[PDB]
C-alpha cells in the first residue's frame, strides 16, 4: 500500500510567484510502480516530468508555467502500484477575498422596441484585468433556435479597468413572446463558465405621468433658461426619455436625465433637466418631453409642451 | 556554498488550506561541516519546538516548519536562516492575483452643520470589510499637527455579509474655514500596507445657488396627496444641504428624495410628497438651501403652495 502527497513551490517573500511552479509528488512494499500526471483529467507529456527512485522512495517533479498554475487547473499524481491506481490532486490555493467576475445583461430600451420597433439586448461585463480581454462571451437562445450575429468591443476605462460589451439584436415578435436569452462567458483563467439570463418584464404595468416646467428669468442668465421634466408613477422601470424642439429630437447628450427610483407608494419617478438657449426659444417657444413605456397609452407615447414666456 | 530552497504543503483539490501549513526548507550541496538552522518570523526568531531537522551526506539537510492556518495566512514573512561557518530564503502567504482591496471615503461637513448649526463634522468611512479585520483603527491627524477632539467609532453589519466602520470627527468652526486638511489613517494587522486619506475645504470659485420650487398638477386619483419638487442649480461647489420646512419647522430626510450633485453644462432635484392634512394646517412649504456662497446668512429659500 503506497502513500502519496504533493509539495509545491513557495512564494516570494513579498507573496509573489516564481517564473515557474514545480510540484513534487512523493510516493511501500517494493515491486512494480509508475507515476502519471493528469491536467484536469487529461494526461500530460511524460517529458515534462523527471522521476527518481531510491531503494522504496519514488518521486516525480512536474514544472508548470505560472500562466497555467494561476489558471486554476487541477493536477493529479496518478500512481499505479503493483495492481491498482491511487490518486492525489492539487490546485492553486484559493484567494482569501477574491473579486470574481461581474456581468450585466440589459433589456431593450422602449424607444427601440416600441417607437423604432427594432429592439436590441446587450451582455455587459465590467471591471476585469487586461489579460482577461480575450474572454470570449458566447450567445445562446433557450428555444434552441440559432442566434443572429452580434458585436464585440473592448474599452479602456478611467480606473485602469477593462469593459467588454456585446450587443445582440433580437426579433420583435420573439422578445414579446416571453423568450429568455443567456450570455455564456469563457476564459482560460476561469475554470468554470459564467452565465446570466434576461427576459421581458412580466407583472403590474402602470402609465407614466409628465409634468413640465420653465424656470423664471434669473438676473445673471440673460441668454439662457433651464427646463425641467418630472416623470413618475410608472411600472416597471424600463423607460426612455427624449426632448423635442421644433419637430426634431435632441440628442441624449443634450439633456441630463437620472435613473428611475421607486416612489413612497406605487410607481417610480425620474427628473430631467434641459438647458436651452435664447436663440432656441426665439425660433419656436415650444419644447416637448416625451417618454416611451410599456403601459403608456395610446401608442406608448406621452408628452407635454412648455414655453419660456 | 550551500543552496537554500523552500517548499510548502500543497492545497486541497478544491483549493482549500489544510489545518497546518508546512514550510520545508531544503539546504543541499554544501561542503560538509558545521551548520545551524534557525527559523525567523517577520525578522525575529521562532523557537525550535516547531521544527524538526534531518541531515545526510555532497551534503544535504532538511528542516520542516509546522505552522497553523492562522499563522501562514496572517500575511507575515518567514525566512529559513542557515548559518554555515549567512544564507537565507524567504516566503510569505501567496498574495491574491486579483485582490478586491480596501476602499475608504472621507467626506466634508454639511453647510447646515457648518453655518446654521455651527457644529461641523467630517466622517471617515471604510466599507466591504470582513468579520475579522473588524478592529481596523481609524486615527486622526492634521496637516499642522494641532490638537483634535475625541472621535467616535461605529460599525454596522450590512446586507451582503460585509462590515462598515465609521468614524466622525468634529472640527472647529473657524479652523475648518481657513483651510486646514485633516487626515484619516486606516491600519489593521491583516492589512499589509497602511491606507491614507485626507480632506479639506474646496478650493474653487464660489457661486450662489438658484432655487426654484414647483408643484405637480392634480393627477387623476391623486387628491389625498400631492407631490412637491424643488430644483437647485448653478451653485459652486458641490457642497450643499437641501431641506424642507412646513409650519416653520424642518422635516426629516425620509419624507423627501433628493438626488446627488451632477455637473451642469451643479444641479440637484428633491421630491417631497405631502398629505391632505399637511397643507390644511399651513399651506406653505419652504425649500431651504444652505450654501457657502448664499446670502445673507448662507441660506436661500423659496416657498410653494398646493392651491
Amino acid at each position, epitope marked *: 500500500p503506497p502513500t502519496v502527497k504533493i509539495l509545491q513551490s513557495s512564494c516570494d517573500g513579498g507573496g509573489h510567484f516564481p517564473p515557474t511552479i514545480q510540484l513534487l509528488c512523493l510516493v511501500y512494499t517494493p515491486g512494480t510502480i509508475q507515476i502519471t500526471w493528469l491536467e484536469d483529467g487529461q494526461v500530460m507529456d511524460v517529458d515534462l516530468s523527471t522521476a527518481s527512485t531510491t531503494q522504496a522512495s519514488t518521486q516525480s517533479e512536474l514544472t508548470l508555467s505560472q500562466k497555467h498554475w494561476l489558471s486554476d487547473r487541477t493536477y493529479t499524481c496518478q500512481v499505479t502500484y503493483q495492481g491498482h491506481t491511487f490518486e492525489d490532486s492539487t490546485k492553486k490555493c484559493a484567494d482569501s477575498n477574491p473579486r470574481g467576475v461581474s456581468a450585466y445583461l440589459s433589456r431593450p430600451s422602449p424607444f427601440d422596441l416600441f417607437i423604432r420597433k427594432s429592439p436590441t439586448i446587450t451582455c455587459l461585463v465590467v471591471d476585469l484585468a487586461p489579460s482577461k480581454g480575450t474572454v470570449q462571451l458566447t450567445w445562446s437562445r433557450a428555444s434552441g433556435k440559432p442566434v443572429n450575429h452580434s458585436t464585440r468591443k473592448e474599452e479602456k476605462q478611467r480606473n485602469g479597468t477593462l469593459t467588454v460589451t456585446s450587443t445582440l439584436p433580437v426579433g420583435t415578435r420573439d422578445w414579446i413572446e416571453g423568450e429568455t436569452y443567456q450570455c455564456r462567458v469563457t476564459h482560460p483563467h476561469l475554470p468554470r463558465a459564467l452565465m446570466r439570463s434576461t427576459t421581458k418584464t412580466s407583472g403590474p404595468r402602470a402609465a407614466p405621468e409628465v409634468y413640465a416646467f420653465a424656470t423664471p428669468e434669473w438676473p445673471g442668465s440673460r441668454d439662457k433658461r433651464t427646463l425641467a421634466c418630472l416623470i413618475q408613477n410608472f411600472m416597471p422601470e424600463d423607460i426612455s426619455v427624449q426632448w423635442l424642439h421644433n419637430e426634431v429630437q435632441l440628442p441624449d447628450a443634450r439633456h441630463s436625465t437620472t435613473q428611475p427610483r421607486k416612489t413612497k407608494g406605487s410607481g417610480f419617478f425620474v427628473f430631467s433637466r434641459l438647458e436651452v438657449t435664447r436663440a432656441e426659444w426665439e425660433q419656436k417657444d415650444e419644447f416637448i418631453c416625451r417618454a416611451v413605456h410599456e403601459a403608456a397609452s395610446p401608442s406608448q407615447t406621452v408628452q407635454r409642451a412648455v414655453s419660456v414666456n | 556554498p550551500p543552496t537554500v530552497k523552500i517548499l510548502q504543503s500543497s492545497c486541497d483539490g478544491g483549493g482549500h488550506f489544510p489545518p497546518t501549513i508546512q514550510l520545508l526548507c531544503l539546504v543541499s550541496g554544501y561542503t560538509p561541516g558545521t551548520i545551524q538552522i534557525t527559523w525567523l518570523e517577520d525578522g525575529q526568531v521562532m523557537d525550535v519546538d516547531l521544527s524538526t531537522a534531518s541531515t545526510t551526506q555532497l551534503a544535504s539537510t532538511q528542516s520542516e516548519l509546522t505552522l497553523s492556518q492562522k499563522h501562514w495566512l496572517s500575511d507575515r514573512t518567514y525566512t529559513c536562516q542557515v548559518t554555515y561557518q549567512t544564507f537565507e530564503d524567504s516566503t510569505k502567504k501567496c498574495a491574491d492575483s*486579483n485582490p478586491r482591496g480596501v476602499s475608504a471615503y472621507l467626506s466634508r461637513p454639511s453647510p447646515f452643520d457648518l453655518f446654521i448649526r455651527k457644529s461641523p463634522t467630517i466622517t471617515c468611512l471604510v466599507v466591504d470589510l470582513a468579520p475579522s479585520k473588524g478592529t481596523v483603527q481609524l486615527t486622526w491627524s492634521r496637516a499642522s499637527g494641532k490638537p483634535v477632539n475625541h472621535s467616535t467609532r461605529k460599525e454596522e453589519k450590512q446586507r451582503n455579509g460585509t462590515l462598515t466602520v465609521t468614524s466622525t470627527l468634529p472640527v472647529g468652526t473657524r479652523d475648518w474655514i481657513e483651510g486646514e486638511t485633516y487626515q484619516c489613517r486606516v491600519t489593521h494587522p491583516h492589512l499589509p500596507r497602511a491606507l491614507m486619506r485626507s480632506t479639506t475645504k474646496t478650493s474653487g470659485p464660489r457661486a450662489a445657488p438658484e432655487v426654484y420650487a414647483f408643484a405637480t398638477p392634480e393627477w387623476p386619483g391623486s387628491r389625498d396627496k400631492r407631490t412637491l419638487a424643488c430644483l437647485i442649480q448653478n451653485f459652486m461647489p458641490e457642497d450643499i444641504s437641501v431641506q424642507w420646512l412646513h409650519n416653520e419647522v424642518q422635516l426629516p430626510d425620509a419624507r423627501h428624495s433628493t438626488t446627488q450633485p451632477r455637473k451642469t453644462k451643479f444641479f440637484v432635484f428633491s421630491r417631497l410628497e405631502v398629505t391632505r392634512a399637511e397643507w390644511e394646517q399651513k399651506d406653505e412649504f419652504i425649500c431651504r438651501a444652505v450654501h457657502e456662497a448664499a446670502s445673507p446668512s448662507q441660506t436661500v429659500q423659496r416657498a410653494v403652495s398646493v392651491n
Partner: antibody
Amino acid sequence: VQLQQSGAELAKPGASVMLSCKASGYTFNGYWMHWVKQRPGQDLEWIGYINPTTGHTEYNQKFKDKATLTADESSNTAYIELSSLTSDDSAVYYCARQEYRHSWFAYWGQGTLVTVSA
Amino acid sequence: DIVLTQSPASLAVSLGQRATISCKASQSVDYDGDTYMNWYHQKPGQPPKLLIYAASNLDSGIPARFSGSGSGTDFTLNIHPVEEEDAATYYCQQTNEDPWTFGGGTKLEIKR
C-alpha cells in the same frame, strides 16, 4: 518590473524603423504599454497604447499616420514602427507601462533616441 | 484634446524654502467624483518618475515634502522644505480622457 528599449538608431528620410520594448518578468493580470515622444527640449507628447493580450489599439490624431503599434504576448515585447521618417521624427521615444487598475504610469523605459538624417 | 498649461515655466527657490507650481486645465479633469491628475518630474537623461497621482496622493517612496491639492481646472504642487535633489523639470498630466496630455513643464532652480 523593468523596461529596456532598443539602443540608438539612425534612419534615412522616407524610410521606416521599428523600436522594441521588452518587459522583464511575467505579469498575470495584463498591462497597457504606451509610447511617449519627447522632441529635443520640448513638450511630452502622447502617442498611444496597445493591450498585447488582444492587440486592441488607440492612437492620437497627430500620430495616427506616423506610428504603428504591435505587440507579442508570449515574449512580453511591444513594437512601434515609424513610417515616413522626417527631421520632425528626430526625437527621444519612451515606452511607458500602465498597470491594471492604475490611472497613471507605473514603469518607464530608458528611451530610444532616433536621429533621422542623411 | 484636454490641454494643460502650467505656470511658471521657470522659477528659483532658496534651499529650505517653499516651491509652488500651478497646473491649469481647459476642462474638468474630474470624473465620477474622482480627480485624474498626476505629477511627474524629469531628471536629465532619465525618463520622468511619478511624484503624485490623483492630485492629492503621493506615490510609494516619495518624500513627505511634496503635497498636491486642487481639483477641477486648477491644481497646485507644493515642496516644503526644498532640498538640493529636487532640481528637475516638473510636468503635470491628466488621465481623464484620451489623448493623455502633459503640461509645458516647470524648471525649478535651487538657489544657494
